[PDB]
Amino acid sequence: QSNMKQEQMRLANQLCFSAYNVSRLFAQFYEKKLKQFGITYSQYLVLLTLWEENPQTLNSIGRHLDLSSNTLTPMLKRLEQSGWVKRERQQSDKRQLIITLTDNGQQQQEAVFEAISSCLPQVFEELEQTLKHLIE
Amino acid sequence: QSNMKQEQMRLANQLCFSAYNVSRLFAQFYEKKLKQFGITYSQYLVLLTLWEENPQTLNSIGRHLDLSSNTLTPMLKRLEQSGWVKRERQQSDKRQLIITLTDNGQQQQEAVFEAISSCLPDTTEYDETKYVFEELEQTLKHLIEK
Ligand SMILES: [Cl-]
Numbered sequence: 001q002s003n004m005k006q007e008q009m010r011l012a013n014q015l016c017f018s019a020y021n022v023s024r025l026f027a028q029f030y031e032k033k034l035k036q037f038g039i040t041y042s043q044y045l046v047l048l049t050l051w052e053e054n055p056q057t058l059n060s061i062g063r064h065l066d067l068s069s070n071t072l073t074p075m076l077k078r079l080e081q082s083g084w085v086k087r088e089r090q091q092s093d094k095r096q097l098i099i100t101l102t103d104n105g106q107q108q109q110e111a112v113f114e115a116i117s118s119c120l121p122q123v124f125e126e127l128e129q130t131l132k133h134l135i136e
Numbered sequence: 137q138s139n140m141k142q143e144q145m146r147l148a149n150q151l152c153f154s155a156y157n158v159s160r161l162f163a164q165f166y167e168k169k170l171k172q173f174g175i176t177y178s179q180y181l182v183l184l185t186l187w188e189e190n191p192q193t194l195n196s197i198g199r200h201l202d203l204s205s206n207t208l209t210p211m212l213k214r215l216e217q218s219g220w221v222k223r224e225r226q227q228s229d230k231r232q233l234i235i236t237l238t239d240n241g242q243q244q245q246e247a248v249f250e251a252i253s254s255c256l257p258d259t260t261e262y263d264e265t266k267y268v269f270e271e272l273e274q275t276l277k278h279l280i281e282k
């Protein structure tokens with residue numbers, strides 16, 4: 001048991017430190033490649049889900065990105081100020097706030113995808129559940 | 137292969153999205169554990185090289201981590217104040233700063249080692265996850281340095 005236990009801890013450290021390094025490299029990569037569009041990574045995530053489902057209520061975006069309304073509201077206005085999306089609230093029923101891509105916001109999807117796709121040269125959900133438990 | 141390339145483009149934005157999101161959870165786990173030992177990421181880097189080669193001069197640590205001596209100076213002082221290392225400034229000849237793990241600093245290696253080891257809960261799925269993060273380490277570095 002002792003020899004196998006020591007080796008499992010070594011493999012745990014090895015894998016988790018690799019991912020630890022990747023967290024730093026990803027942050028630099030996205031900052032460098034998204035600069036040309038004037039958007040942050042979280043803004044890019046908003047555009048990411050809008051390009052899959054458009055339009056979307058802010059509550060729908062928060063459910064996709066696991067982000068609160070207090071987090072989305074500032075940057076949703078930043079994407080509207082930069083011309084990516086439009087904001088208009090319903091006057092009945094759920095009273096929700098609808099986010100809709102502009103014409104320019106929709107066209108630029110391929111250019112954004114191309115700038116990011118190089119992250120790879122030409123399972124995760126189980127770790128996300130376990131890691132979240134360890135942190136909280 | 138127009139349509140074929142736009143599909144690989146989409147998967148790429150999706151596999152990297154999920155790999156980043158899980159790497160941030162590993163990072164938050166590290167930050168939580170390192171805080172329990174009272175150390176930072178940068179201090180952890182110094183301890184990691186000392187646990188490989190001990191003692192080391194200040195300059196040798198700088199070569200291992202590619203950090204300047206000015207950057208390392210407050211870190212080593214903090215590691216000495218918190219009981220991890222000893223600092224010995226030679227008073228003649230090369231006048232190096234020799235960094236040596238304390239008895240506690242040596243004993244803490246296995247405690248940190250074990251604490252981090254809980255970051256994971258299959259051998260096959262390990263090799264695939266390891267393989268993806270190994271190639272991201274290599275690819276992202278090459279792209280960042282352009
Ligand atoms: Cl054994």
Ligand SMILES: [Cu+2]
Binds near residue numbers: 001002003004
């Ligand atoms: Cu044994």
Ligand SMILES: [Cu+2]
Binds near residue numbers: 137138139140
């Ligand atoms: Cu084609």
